[PDB]
Write a protein that binds this ligand. Structure first.
Ligand SMILES: [K+]
Ligand SMILES: [K+]
Lengths: 249, 249
């Protein structure tokens, strides 16, 4: 059967003290009857508030980015700073950082390896753009992305690693990913891990769908063989995120 | 007479909850007699603990970076989020962000303009590299940087703008600029502001020096005609910062 599902809330660069606290109150009051690891990834600024307010046993807190080491890097946040601050989860290599902030396949790989070495649970993000998919390069792109990450990891490190597939080709492009299209991408990633890392690792690896979801389509998406949860964007700032949690059973 | 001096502490990407707490406790117990605006720019993560424990009346809290608007920008922090969090000061266009994180002259200018429009006090960083100075291109490089900023500002905006002249070759290298080198650069900057923006604006404009400032060289640096304070990196993580504050007369 599937490993423990994950419902990750990527709040991105959003939220006020009031709006986020209200949403945290809803999460705290939400009863969850099945084994699922829920994750709340707030901005660095809201990490303190989230730590103090979030109390649900099946919820942990994550950062949306970091650099490997502390030092002369004005504006950035390092892994030791997050570790000292009690944050043990992190989202790395998000498509927006790959696009906007110069994070190459190797830069993402270095951050992930650094985070794992520091003891973090890591949600590593991969996925192809519309240009790459339409040019028939979905497979080569996503496999190159995860190959770069694996190059800096050992087999034992994958116990701390989570893979999130972002259908970037469907992000504000007008396109819509079908459950079949998502499954095909997940199965492809699964197949690579099995042959390159191990069938044991592949069986335990959580592959999260990182595309647009609501309560309804998330239930359908979780029916797919190689979908192990969701890395949610916009819907994670809404009460709808509760439905997405329930979508993982 | 000089305008109100500024002692800015740029902790950069450093510090634990404990180490920064000790710095703050020292700052709180430090008697500051003269008129000076002290600034502490911690990481996004430590903003909350700084707001809570820092209570010295002549100290304000700053961010080390931001982007203009909230939205789908994973890992980043926006100006509206900082404003909601009660943070009203910010350092922008630091040499480390110009070099590592793709912040061009025009990118810096847009952030500065956005910050001023949102009601922030802005410490805008400019400065030349080692090669640019030794090739005798300090003037054209530094003045081009502030010109790009100036293009995006109305005259009224300069009241919220603080200029930090920070030569890259002096950043953390232990090679502080001589009082003459700093004065020469500050005089050049204020002269350009006087001619292009107005003599009234230039008379009120604060020009800080940044680059290996410590408790031993600060006093002599501030004695110069056009030096209105300091942007401090490494020494701002030490008790030495108190001596730099007092060095502003
Ligand atoms: K969504
Ligand atoms: K968003």
């Amino acid at each position: 059967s599937k490993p423990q599902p994950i419902a990750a809330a990527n709040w991105k660069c959003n939220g006020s003290q009031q709006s986020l606290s209200e949403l945290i109150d809803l999460f705290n009051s939400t009863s969850i009857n099945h084994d699922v690891q829920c994750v709340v990834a707030s901005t660095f600024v809201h990490l303190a508030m989230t730590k103090e307010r979030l109390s649900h046993p099946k919820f942990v807190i994550a950062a949306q980015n970091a650099i490997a080491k502390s030092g002369a890097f004005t504006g950035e946040v390092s892994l030791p700073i997050l570790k000292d601050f009690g944050v043990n989860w992190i989202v790395l290599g998000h498509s927006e950082r790959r696009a906007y902030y110069g994070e190459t396949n190797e830069i993402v790989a270095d951050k992930v390896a650094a985070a794992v070495a520091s003891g973090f649970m890591v949600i590593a993000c991969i996925g192809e753009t519309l240009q790459e998919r339409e040019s028939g390069r979905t497979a080569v792109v996503v496999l190159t992305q995860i190959a770069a990450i694996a190059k800096k990891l050992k087999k034992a490190d994958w116990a701390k690693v989570v893979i999130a597939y972002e259908p970037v080709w469907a992000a504000g492009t007008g396109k819509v990913a079908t459950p079949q299209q998502a499954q095909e991408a997940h199965a492809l990633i699964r197949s690579w891990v099995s042959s390159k890392i191990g069938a044991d690792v592949a069986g335990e690896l959580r592959i999260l769908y990182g595309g647009s979801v609501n309560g309804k389509n998330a239930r359908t998406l979780y029916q797919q063989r190689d979908v192990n949860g969701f890395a949610v964007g916009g819907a994670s700032l809404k009460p709808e995120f509760v439905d997405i949690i329930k979508a993982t059973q």
